[PDB]
């Protein structure tokens, strides 16, 4: 595996039609950890629930 590689996965906000609560998450864009509205389902690993977790990995 390779946990650092998750840092270049594309931002994926998830499926709007799910019944999950939406939530702030963070993703790495190559120069910064950027906040986005995660739809609470789907997505990929470039998805952090704290800016600190994004910064400590990417």
Numbering used by the authors: 1 to 58
Authors' text:
This protein consists of two domains of equivalent size, triggers apoptosis in different tumor cell lines, and promotes regression of tumor growth, and reduction of metastasis. Amblyomin-X is a Kunitz-like FXa inhibitory protein of 106 amino acids and 7 cysteine residues. As a recombinant protein, Amblyomin-X inhibits Factor Xa (FXa) activity in vitro and presents the anticoagulant property in animal models.
The synthesis of two truncated (synthetic) regions of Amblyomin-X, one called the Kunitz domain which corresponds to fragments (1–57) of Amblyomin-X contains the first 6 cysteine residues, the other the C-ter domain which corresponds to fragment 58-106 in which cysteine 67 has been mutated to the Serine residue, as well as the associated peptides, were performed by solid-phase peptide synthesis (SPPS). The crystal structure of the Kunitz domain of Amblyomin-X belongs to the orthorhombic space group P212121 with two molecules in the asymmetric unit. The diffraction limit of 1.60 Å was recorded for the best data set collected. The X-ray analysis confirms that the first portion of Amblyomin-X (amino acids 1–58) possesses a typical Kunitz structure, with two α-helices and two β-sheets kept together with three disulfide bridges (Cys7-Cys58, Cys33-Cys54, Cys18-Cys41). The main difference is remarkable around the TFPI-K2 binding loop (Pro11-Thr19) where the loop of Kunitz domain of Amblyomin-X (Ala13-Glu23) is longer than those of the human TFPI-k2. The diversity between the two loops of these Kunitz domains could suggest a different interaction of Kunitz domain of Amblyomin-X with the FXa. This consideration is in agreement with the evidence that Kunitz domain of Amblyomin-X showed lower inhibitory activity against FXa than TFPI-K2. In contrast, the N-ter Kunitz domain of Amblyomin-X is not capable of crossing through the cell membrane but is associated with tumor cell cytotoxicity when it is microinjected into the cells or fused to TAT cell-penetrating peptide. No microinjection cells were used as control. This result indicates that the Kunitz domain could be responsible for cytotoxicity and its internalization is crucial for this effect.
